Design a protein around this ligand. Sequence first.
Ligand code: HEM
Ligand code: HEM
Ligand SMILES: *[C@@H]1O[C@H](CO)[C@@H](O)[C@H](O)[C@H]1NC(C)=O
Ligand SMILES: *[C@@H]1O[C@H](CO)[C@@H](O)[C@H](O)[C@H]1NC(C)=O
Ligand SMILES: [Ca+2]
Ligand SMILES: [Ca+2]
Ligand SMILES: [Ca+2]
Lengths: 146, 640, 738, 141, 254
Amino acid sequence: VHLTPEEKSAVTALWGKVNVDEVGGEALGRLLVVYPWTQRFFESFGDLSTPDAVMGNPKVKAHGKKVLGAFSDGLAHLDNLKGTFATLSELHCDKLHVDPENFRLLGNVLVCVLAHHFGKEFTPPVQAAYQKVVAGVANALAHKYH
Amino acid sequence: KGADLSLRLVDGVTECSGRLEVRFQGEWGTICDDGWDSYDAAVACKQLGCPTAVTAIGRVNASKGFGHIWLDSVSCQGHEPAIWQCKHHEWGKHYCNHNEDAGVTCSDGSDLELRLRGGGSRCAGTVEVEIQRLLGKVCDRGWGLKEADVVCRQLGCGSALKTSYQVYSKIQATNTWLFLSSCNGNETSLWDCKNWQWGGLTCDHYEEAKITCSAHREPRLVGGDIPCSGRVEVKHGDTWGSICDSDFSLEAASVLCRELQCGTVVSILGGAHFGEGNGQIWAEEFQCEGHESHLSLCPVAPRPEGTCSHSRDVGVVCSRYTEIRLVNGKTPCEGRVELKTLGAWGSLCNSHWDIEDAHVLCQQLKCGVALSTPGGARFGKGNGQIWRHMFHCTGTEQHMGDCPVTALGASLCPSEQVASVICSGNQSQTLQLRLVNGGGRCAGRVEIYHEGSWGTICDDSWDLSDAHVVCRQLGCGEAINATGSAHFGEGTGPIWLDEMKCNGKESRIWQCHSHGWGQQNCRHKEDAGVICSEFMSLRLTSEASREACAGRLEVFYNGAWGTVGKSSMSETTVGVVCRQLGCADKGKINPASLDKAMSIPMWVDNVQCPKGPDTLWQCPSSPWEKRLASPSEETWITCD
Amino acid sequence: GSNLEMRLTRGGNMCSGRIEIKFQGRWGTVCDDNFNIDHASVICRQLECGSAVSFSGSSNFGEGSGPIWFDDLICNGNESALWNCKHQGWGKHNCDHAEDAGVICSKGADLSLRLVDGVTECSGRLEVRFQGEWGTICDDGWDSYDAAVACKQLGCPTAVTAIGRVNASKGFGHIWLDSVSCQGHEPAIWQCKHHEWGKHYCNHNEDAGVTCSDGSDLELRLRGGGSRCAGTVEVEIQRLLGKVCDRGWGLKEADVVCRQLGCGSALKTSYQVYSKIQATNTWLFLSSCNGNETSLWDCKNWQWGGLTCDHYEEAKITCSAHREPRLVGGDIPCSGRVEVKHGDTWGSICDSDFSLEAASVLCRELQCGTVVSILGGAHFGEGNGQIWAEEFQCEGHESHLSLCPVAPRPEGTCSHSRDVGVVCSRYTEIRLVNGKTPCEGRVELKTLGAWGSLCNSHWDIEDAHVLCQQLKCGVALSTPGGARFGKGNGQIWRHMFHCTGTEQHMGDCPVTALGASLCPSEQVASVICSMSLRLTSEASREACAGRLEVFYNGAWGTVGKSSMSETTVGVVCRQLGCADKGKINPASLDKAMSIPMWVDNVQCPKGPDTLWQCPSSPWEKRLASPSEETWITCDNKIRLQEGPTSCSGRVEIWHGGSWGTVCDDSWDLDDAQVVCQQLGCGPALKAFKEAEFGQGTGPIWLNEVKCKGNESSLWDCPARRWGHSECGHKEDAAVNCT
Amino acid sequence: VLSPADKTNVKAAWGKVGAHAGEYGAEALERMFLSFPTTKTYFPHFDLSHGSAQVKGHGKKVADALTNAVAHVDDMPNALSALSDLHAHKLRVDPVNFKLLSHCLLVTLAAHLPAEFTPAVHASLDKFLASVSTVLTSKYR
Amino acid sequence: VCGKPKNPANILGGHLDAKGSFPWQAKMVSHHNLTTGATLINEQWLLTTAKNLFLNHSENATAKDIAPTLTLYVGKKQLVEIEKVVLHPNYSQVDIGLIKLKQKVSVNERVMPICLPSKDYAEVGRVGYVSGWGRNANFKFTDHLKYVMLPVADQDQCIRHYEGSTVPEKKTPKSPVGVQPILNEHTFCAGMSKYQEDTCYGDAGSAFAVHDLEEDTWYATGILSFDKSCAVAEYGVYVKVTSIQDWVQKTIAE
Ligand code: HEM
Ligand code: HEM
Ligand SMILES: *[C@@H]1O[C@H](CO)[C@@H](O)[C@H](O)[C@H]1NC(C)=O
Ligand SMILES: *[C@@H]1O[C@H](CO)[C@@H](O)[C@H](O)[C@H]1NC(C)=O
Ligand SMILES: [Ca+2]
Ligand SMILES: [Ca+2]
Ligand SMILES: [Ca+2]
């Protein structure tokens, strides 16, 4: 359904305050650490075994950064996500064949890293809104390959 | 190429618009709009040889296709010579349905029209668009301040202030919708906003985005002696009209003066006080509450059909004086301060001058911070009169007219003691005790803002030396009375200091010997207050009438009541008296009642105030001189 | 034969590992089913590896491989070889390879215990050296028996043994032992029962520690509560100061602490704002011990340091011994000068610093009932020594004076000439005589200094029940009639009590002694438990001067002029609210009317507030002669204090049983004129404010007094409600009239 | 799964939570009712509003159950058996919901306890709540 | 035809069945909306487990009770009815039922049975592929078919992982999962993946498929019986197909 204005507004204002050069890469490497089987898709990077290796490897944050940007574009246009991500969805889904459920796993670990940085100011309504956003994202991203 | 490829448009408004169908091996089929973008549309328009200045996606009057979807996830760079040379997965393998069939409309720009309908002017209402002579509306889905601002800009009405609807004539639902996903906002036209969609898709069952921009009804004041005073005329649409005095509330005048940045409303004047207007009178009452930022957001009510005449045009006077300038600076942000009063420019006296006053001056002139206040006629003395107005700013006011001003009795300013300022000139340079309820800055309960809160002083050990420290610290002259026992009523909050024993030489109250912050045994019934020598108050005294607002005008100053001299007193002054007492707009000077056995001290005569000031205290006069009035010099007035 | 070989495999050395036996050239293992220390002792002897240290299942050495050679062995351990242990035969087993036993012997183990980072050699973190490496033990289950074993092994004193790590860091590396729980008699910690070696879930934040002490260094004190019996509980252990965390801190633990300091019982976790003390970073945690312990150190399983608690900050206590009242120098224990012991010193209280509510609460805590009067001017004699400079600004509902807030007196010396005295309402001096126990007997009351038997004419079992209950003897079983315990040789008291049977003290029952009927000498009570007053004047409207008349049995009558003391006059005037004292006037000869008298010779001690409590002659209606009528005048309800004359001074008025002041709010020359004029001094010259004649005492009875100056009396003037004042004694009104 | 390392980490992290576990449990539940409104259909008679006593107490229960679980973590099914049957059979709770509340509970502990939420613990905590939500689900039918 | 998938291969893990590489997998749904697996064993018969068939039912249920409550899908979205079901006479040790179809299914690129083996392929270390429709990491039924590769584990290690000892009179249930698996000579065990992937609720009924590279033929070596593992316990347990071949041939003949 459509997002009520004060949800999207609290979301965007927070994403504004979100440091865009670190969080995404930590969320990604965290997905790598908690559910190690995703390393298979990224295994061109190197050893994805220790937390220090994952957190340090410059290609992990390079990818996380580009994905977080793509998500910024999502938050930008929240009613039409499918078309905006249609090609990215093809890259990951058609060429790579990532299972779309791990998008939500990452999105969930993302909200966790989000909550990690923002502590008490990340409130149950704000979480419920970001969950709605990263949901709509996960779905649009999962739209290919029915 | 390959196995016989061709592209055509079907069910278009023209041969180069419509749903796009590709013939492959002899059969026609459609393409899904999955990933269909402006580069794809541009390639399609280019291949048909039509103008590509404006290219819309979507199917206008075009049916849904049938059969095969040959291409999917088309992604052109715009240089491809044909759509089947762009990237795609393969041919005939798809998940798309015929509801997602791509369509195009290619245009040269000559037919797209934009207008506002139903908002009472051409610059407020529902956003209606006409594309290929088909009317539709912009959907509120994806509608932000950027899209509204682009639309507002295209009509040359400035910026969008509100997405509000205004109850007027309602427009037939258009079944065709335009979706804009987003523009940056620097575009000249909404159609220049990228990737806008015309028809096909359904927005959402909520629709009919309506807007009011800052140019919907534009007020101005005409014919007053200062820019913040005059008759109100409002342009609605492209026509200016006067407003009737019945149709313009105090709240609406407050909104206007705030919007005009003229401060607070000082007076509303009926009866064409600034002269009759000319032309149209608006038949709408603004029933705003008065907290609204703009008259464009105030509700309008239809006239009960009452005929107003220009003899009833409303006039407003607001509080700010704006005519201040710097003279003989090397830059416009330095110079001698000259003020225009009574129509004449004159140098301001420096006798009560400081960096906060200069800061306020530099800020009002948009010159940033004051860098120095050079003493002496460094910018020259000027050849004019020296204005002896003493401002008493806190340094936080935005305009000098918002600052307290005293001109009565001000000492003679030496010719070399003129105010001057050097401002930084760059808007990037930046950088308490009060009396309450005393009827002026120099009397009341003493409240101090300390540690983030206002608090009171106990009357324990409260003496004349402590009051003298307070009065001196505020520039209020000498202490006349140190009142205890909550004479001005009980204060609220903490009592910060108690058993005060100032020697009278301390620059700050907390430098006096005290028990220390917050250690006190008093209650607010013992809160101390002061009345200093610079407390001024006005009254009318009558011996013969219970009319509190008709009598001889006496001012209390420097501890005594005295009469005002009738010499040079104008009917403007009478208007001031009648407004200040809240009695009426006008009155007459009565002959004085000779039956009075007592000569009174007079303090000042020849007091001449312009139109605008609400209190006699604001009216220029002669210096303070205590003389005995003759009964013939007493001014007795009766307000209507 | 010589075809039997033994080795230990995978235990890091030749004296630790899984048991492998070579038989017919094949190695195989032994299951741990029915395996014990005697098997390990055989193995450790065979390898010359010393004593057995541990046996374990496959978990510590992993599964073996091959045949299981022996199973369900039953040896006593006195065998030359393991194959001499009882066995079912080679290759007979029920075990799998998950039950392969392994052992570690002392020569392959190498165990030592030390303390690290202690304040002394007998405190610190416990570290064990094993096979050359040092590691810690987790405190999961670490108890006082373990600490006692550790102290014994170190040769340290075992009189007092604490757990925990004082200033000791977290360990690193291996945690070798976990949840050790022996019986306490074992000679070494590795001889107690424990889990499998090297198998643990603990981390290095959990490290056991001990402090061994003889008790000579453990100190306990309260700081910041103004006395040794109130404040934050500070402890000093091995010269380290710390505080008790409130987690698990209840009134029972606080009462244990209060008892250890000899401060009586803990009354409240209250904090008292007095000293702001530096945070101690070290906390003591308790674990719910019963409260009947004599010392906090006698509480079980208390932990000294090592844990952080968050939301559980500073624990402070106020015990009853923070301030202990007593009454000194009165004729009965519930009357006297108030002295309060604060800390270890007794002090008097100033008459300005002790309200009626505080005296009521104090005697109630002392169980002496309600306040009858406050008496300034050292009425009960001078106190001695220090005077407390603190005002109790209590409301009077507090259970103990320790709970009412106190404010420090602003700089000023009180002297014992202004010591406050209080008398409250209960009579406590009642006794049983000739009982077999002190809680049965004939009831004797002491009045006028003499003990006497109470008459039984109305003495029922409910009254006796209340007395025995007061004496904590339970219920009354009988009220034997007659002098079964003898009549006594003294006077018989004819006092009539009117208890409901629910009162806690005999002094709470209404008492009448005036006119009470006689009692025959043999009708004495014994038990075995398990009216209107007026002054009449014919010629003046004066409620406070006149002939004393009592309404009784439906008629007003005079009191006969006989045996009335100034104490009796004080009683009548207090009940009438006139003054403490007064004088007997000559009777007015101008009255021709003879009045019925009901009672005479009424003699009451000091203490009673009402004439009903005053002993007298029986009721007898006789005609008074005009010469026998008693006319009295008590002094005025209004006085001037500390002025140079009797008509200048601070204004004090007697109301509600206390003296009090007048606020200068609305105080004017006409109010002062009325008060002095009522005293018959001439015109008012000045109304002074701000206690010009010194500060007064007690309640500010009147505020916003607004006389017209033509009223006969200040009681006739419009004023605020009696006893409701916002003013302080700083605002006490004063006058000087001609 | 659940190596020694994991087990140790989960215990050490769940200790430092202590008595606040209850209020978090309720905060966790509140988030869940806000995030996934369908789970409200499992609590008909409960007052679901902010800080409701019923929510707060049930949360104190889930908290103490969890602490119990971590006290002896090496056998979960004996300890949780009665809750197995309570949610599994009688209440028939759809297994997606445990993973919902699990994740909300991870967000909650993250938000309120930033310093301890290093990746290793986020890992073994998620594994731990997996293992539990499984033991509760495996008697579903 | 046995063992010739059109696109041969190269649960909460990876390896999405993107090309439809396991055409013998069928998806059965119970009356109470639960999805489980089944294995096509000829053009008219499929193998599954008795427990799967006994879902949403009492422990004392017959064939006519269970038969009308099932729903069955083959391939992608092709509904297939059911003629009858034949349960194994023993269910405490052979958790197996056969379903017989009313008509022959059409065989093509997307729907084809796996072959029944003539050799014993259950040698320790051999890695087989299990495809499944079961629940994912979010404990929701997966949206797309997936598969994982698991190696066969040591049978005794499995016995020890579930039961105290391998010796009968010393055994006690020690399953980290409440429900106990069925372990006997008719079963074998297999460890989970090495990137930490395993089977979970709903995977039962799928084939333990072995790809024989000498002949290029895929064989159903086991049928996953205990489907309650969730990467929390260590090993899945499979029924040995060699030990039921005769019963299967008999049921098919009848
Ligand atoms: C869930 C949020 C995700 C976001 C926001 C996202 C977005 C992106 C974007 C925009 C790129 C770069 C596109 C390009 O280079 O053309 C990228 C790279 C990539 N994505 Fe994702 N994606 C997400 C999920 C995933 C996941 C979960 C995986 C694998 C498990 C994945 C697989 C990849 C790979 C392998 C690359 C790098 C390709 C290469 O190095 O050649 N994506 N992601
Ligand atoms: C770690 C996860 C969980 C634990 C430890 C747990 C445990 C409990 C406990 C202790 C109770 C209350 C028993 C009592 O007060 O007598 C309870 C009740 C209940 N639970 Fe859970 N539960 C969990 C997850 C869930 C979830 C996520 C749901 C639903 C979405 C659920 C459904 C219910 C219901 C319907 C009740 C009945 C409430 C009542 O009887 O008062 N459980 N569970
Ligand atoms: C203030 O003081 C002056 C004398 O200094 C006195 O005349 C005047 O009445 C006072 N004002 C009052 C009491 O309000
Ligand atoms: C513990 O305290 C003692 C006594 O002050 C000191 O000697 C010792 O170094 C301390 N140990 C630490 C801080 O580890
Ligand atoms: Ca495209
Ligand atoms: Ca045995
Ligand atoms: Ca122990």
